[PDB]
Amino acid sequence: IIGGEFTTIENQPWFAAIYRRHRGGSVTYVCGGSLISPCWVISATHCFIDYPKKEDYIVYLGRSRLNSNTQGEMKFEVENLILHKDYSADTLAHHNDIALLKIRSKEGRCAQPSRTIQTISLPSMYNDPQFGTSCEITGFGKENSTDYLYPEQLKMTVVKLISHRECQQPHYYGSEVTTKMLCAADPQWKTDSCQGDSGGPLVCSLQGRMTLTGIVSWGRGCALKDKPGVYTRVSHFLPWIRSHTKE
């Protein structure tokens, strides 16, 4: 996250931190995600496409720091890793960038809600906030494009939703952005998502209710003028989500 503020997991209880195990014992951060139900975490497919082996992943809930433990955190294994079959990546754009991870503790249990672990609500069919609406994003991503390390503490910032007409302008992303995506940015182009924030949630207050409206997917550079962050439009994947989470 470029700009913004450092935060704690108590203020973003649905945030899931995903790591990948490596030969030897090193565990590196891979992507963010969101808890949509006790047993399910939603993220982005571009995070796992190159290494689709569920056994090599670890999911943490209730965690505020990148490399240290947090009181109340819970560790999970991945029972099932579901990637979108029509995922694809062009020069910049990533299509159908959404994924589901069924989690389970060593005892075989799902998440137990607490002050630091809570689910986030899914949107209704084609029910997105009006453009111009302020929403928040959260992640352990880079603070500057020139950085090569990620911050140790979780961050968050607020960005505004941009219309498809504006985001499709030539100086923006032209025809690369589709109706299955959502653009969001800071009117001053000072804050934005960045490398390492992928999979994370774009949360918007829709009718007094915190709703998971987007998933960090792609964008040209970070916090550059006329180059908004692009998010997977969750409301357009409800069918896919429901069919896969059932049984």
Ligand X SMILES: N=C(N)Nc1ccc(CC(=O)c2ccccc2)cc1
Could you list the active site residues?
Answer: 46, 97, 198
Binding region for ligand X (CB under 6 A) out of 105-113, 123-131, 202-210, 222-230: 222-230
CB of 16 to ligand X, least distance (A): 16
CB burial of 197-234 (b: ≥16 within 10 Å; e: otherwise) equals: bbbbbbbbebeeebbbbbbbbbbeebbeeebbbbbbbb
We find the least distance from the C-beta atom of residue 91 to ligand X, in angstroms, to be 12
Site size for ligand X, by CB under 6 A? 16
Taking the C-alpha atoms of residue 166 and residue 179, their distance in angstroms, rounded to an integer, is 12
Tell whether residue 46 is a contact of ligand X (CB under 6 A).
yes
CB of 136 closer than 8 Å to CB of 128: no
Question: In the complex, what is the shortest distance from the CB of residue 138 to ligand X, in angstroms, rounded to a whole number?
Answer: 13
Decide if residue 137 touches ligand X (CB under 6 A): no
CA atoms within 13 A on the CB side of 203: 24
CB of 102 to ligand X, least distance (A): 23
Give 143 or 197: the residue with its C-beta nearer to ligand X.
197
| 7, 45, 116, 193: which one binds ligand X (CB under 6 A) | 193
Does residue 84 belong to the site contacting ligand X (CB under 6 A)?
A: no
String of contacts with ligand X for each residue 25-44, x by CB under 6 A = --------------------
Among 3, 17, 197, 237, binds ligand X (CB under 6 A): 197
CB of 65 within 8 A of CB of 17? no
Handedness of CA 138, 142, 143, 145 (dihedral sign): negative
Q: What is the CA radius of gyration of the chain?
A: 17
- Judged by CB under 6 A, the stretch of 7-15, 127-135, 172-180, 188-196 that binds ligand X is 188-196
CB closer to ligand X out of 218 and 237: 218
Contacts of residues 219-223 at CB distance under 8 Å and 24 or more positions apart, as own/partner, are 219/92, 219/192, 219/193, 220/92, 220/173, 221/145, 222/2, 222/142, 222/144, 222/145, 222/192, 222/193, 222/194, 222/195, 223/2, 223/3, 223/145, 223/186, 223/189, 223/190, 223/191, 223/192, 223/194
- Residue with smaller CB distance to ligand X, 76 or 218: 218
Is residue 101 within 8 A of residue 81, CB to CB? The reply is yes
The minimum distance between CB 227 and ligand X, in angstroms, equals 6
- 150 lies in the site for ligand X, by CB under 6 A: no
Among 18, 30, 229, 237, binds ligand X (CB under 6 A): 229
Instruction: Give residues in contact with ligand X (CB under 6 A).
Output: 46, 94, 192-198, 216, 218-219, 221-222, 227, 229
